[PDB]
Design an enzyme around this catalytic site. Sequence first.
Site, PDB file in Angstrom:
ATOM      1  N   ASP A   1       0.766  -1.229   0.000  1.00  0.00           N
ATOM      2  CA  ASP A   1       0.000   0.000   0.000  1.00  0.00           C
ATOM      3  C   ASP A   1       0.802   1.288   0.000  1.00  0.00           C
ATOM      4  O   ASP A   1       1.393   1.647   1.010  1.00  0.00           O
ATOM      5  CB  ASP A   1      -1.017  -0.051   1.170  1.00  0.00           C
ATOM      6  CG  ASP A   1      -1.925   1.144   1.326  1.00  0.00           C
ATOM      7  OD1 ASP A   1      -2.232   1.788   0.311  1.00  0.00           O
ATOM      8  OD2 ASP A   1      -2.365   1.411   2.466  1.00  0.00           O
TER       9      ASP A   1
ATOM     10  N   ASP B   1      -2.642   5.394  -5.088  1.00  0.00           N
ATOM     11  CA  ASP B   1      -2.864   4.428  -4.016  1.00  0.00           C
ATOM     12  C   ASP B   1      -3.029   3.010  -4.460  1.00  0.00           C
ATOM     13  O   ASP B   1      -4.122   2.612  -4.856  1.00  0.00           O
ATOM     14  CB  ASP B   1      -4.060   4.880  -3.138  1.00  0.00           C
ATOM     15  CG  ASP B   1      -4.128   4.283  -1.738  1.00  0.00           C
ATOM     16  OD1 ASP B   1      -3.414   3.286  -1.480  1.00  0.00           O
ATOM     17  OD2 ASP B   1      -4.919   4.803  -0.899  1.00  0.00           O
TER      18      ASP B   1
HETATM   19  C1  LIG Z   1      -5.323  -4.865  -2.456  1.00  0.00           C
HETATM   20  C2  LIG Z   1      -5.689  -3.397  -2.655  1.00  0.00           C
HETATM   21  O1  LIG Z   1      -5.724  -3.136  -4.063  1.00  0.00           O
HETATM   22  C3  LIG Z   1      -7.098  -3.092  -2.098  1.00  0.00           C
HETATM   23  N1  LIG Z   1      -7.374  -3.511  -0.692  1.00  0.00           N
HETATM   24  C4  LIG Z   1      -6.823  -2.669   0.401  1.00  0.00           C
HETATM   25  C5  LIG Z   1      -7.675  -2.994   1.598  1.00  0.00           C
HETATM   26  C6  LIG Z   1      -8.805  -3.621   1.192  1.00  0.00           C
HETATM   27  C7  LIG Z   1      -8.779  -3.835  -0.311  1.00  0.00           C
HETATM   28  C8  LIG Z   1      -9.861  -4.257   2.093  1.00  0.00           C
HETATM   29  C9  LIG Z   1     -10.504  -5.438   1.628  1.00  0.00           C
HETATM   30  C10 LIG Z   1     -11.387  -6.162   2.447  1.00  0.00           C
HETATM   31  C11 LIG Z   1     -11.615  -5.734   3.765  1.00  0.00           C
HETATM   32  C12 LIG Z   1     -10.947  -4.606   4.264  1.00  0.00           C
HETATM   33  C13 LIG Z   1     -10.042  -3.891   3.460  1.00  0.00           C
HETATM   34  N2  LIG Z   1      -9.477  -2.798   4.041  1.00  0.00           N
HETATM   35  C14 LIG Z   1      -8.152  -2.466   4.100  1.00  0.00           C
HETATM   36  C15 LIG Z   1      -7.723  -1.949   5.350  1.00  0.00           C
HETATM   37  C16 LIG Z   1      -6.388  -1.583   5.528  1.00  0.00           C
HETATM   38  C17 LIG Z   1      -5.506  -1.615   4.436  1.00  0.00           C
HETATM   39  C18 LIG Z   1      -5.920  -2.108   3.188  1.00  0.00           C
HETATM   40  C19 LIG Z   1      -7.250  -2.550   2.996  1.00  0.00           C
END
Ligand SMILES: C[C@@H](O)CN1CC2=C(C1)c1ccccc1Nc1ccccc12
Length: 333
Positions: free
Chosen positions: A36, A219
């Site tokens: 991230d 992001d």
């Molecule tokens: C992989 C990227 O492109 C997108 N991701 C990032 C991300 C997602 C989906 C998410 C998916 C399911 C449940 C909760 C979360 N929340 C979360 C919290 C903290 C940091 C990253 C996340």
Amino acid sequence: LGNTTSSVILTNYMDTQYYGEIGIGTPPQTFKVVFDTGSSNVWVPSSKCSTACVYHKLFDASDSSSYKHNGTELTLRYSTGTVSGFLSQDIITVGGITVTQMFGEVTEMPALPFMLAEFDGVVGMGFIEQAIGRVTPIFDNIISQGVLKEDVFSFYYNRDSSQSLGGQIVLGGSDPQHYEGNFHYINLIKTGVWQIQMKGVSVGSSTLLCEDGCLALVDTGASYISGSTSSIEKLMEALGAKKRLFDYVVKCNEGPTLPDISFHLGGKEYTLTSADYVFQESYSSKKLCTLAIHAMDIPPPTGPTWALGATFIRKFYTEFDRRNNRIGFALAR
Ligand SMILES: C[C@@H](O)CN1CC2=C(C1)c1ccccc1Nc1ccccc12
Ligand SMILES: *[C@@H]1O[C@H](CO)[C@@H](O)[C@H](O)[C@H]1NC(C)=O
């Protein structure tokens, strides 16, 4: 020696979650993580976790010979959810690069939203300025080692398909097998945040939003392109999309006829066709299709900002240059 150019293969979970593998400890304990650029902390669930923990791999410090205790309590708040735990230190392996890292062992991982997460934790690719507890980010510690060919990292996100590659992260450079042409660079507004200046968002061949300029956070940990509630309302009106929950929808038959969305960054226009932003799951005039764009009111210092997430990244292969404080885009293949 500055000649290392390591890569981590990613898994694409339904065009919304892109995660790879890291190893923590001696012997290595493996975890599925999101890389991230929106955050700067490393965290995985702890064996000391008392709702979503049942469904995830847990880090057991007592099975690691290289572990060094710290215990500083920590809370990591995200646009999706919040986690809490304490700090710990151990060896972390990211595609053949080994680093001593301070990370968070999470003890409070709520079933909403983490039960939906296919990944165990997060590896923050952001800067120390955005790190909670002022903990040195993993990329900064890889830089300090002097192993990389270049102080850069790249992201390739594929379109969901079949035993194909879900995505790929390159530490130390870019993979020309995953992009066409050449990179176009945009300098960061300021160091400390992977955010660039946007000079307009246009629907079709006319500029509708961001006419007086706005911000774009690039992001990798965001699933969708997002903007302020006001901006997304204007954009969705222009598209003739209707609100259903926190999702915007169109009639599936109308999906392939939706106009191009263009983002004016640096010198050029980065265009997404309807095939890039509509989850075309049917072509029926009776069914409703989801858009990979949503509202997200990012709080200051970072926000108010747009966020160019996986929807954008799938189209444009992205390079994050720490040496030059710039972001490069090239069309993905
Ligand atoms: C992989 C990227 O492109 C997108 N991701 C990032 C991300 C997602 C989906 C998410 C998916 C399911 C449940 C909760 C979360 N929340 C979360 C919290 C903290 C940091 C990253 C996340
Ligand atoms: C944990 O690490 C921080 C790093 O700033 C340090 O200041 C602190 O004293 C450490 N705490 C323990 C208990 O080791």
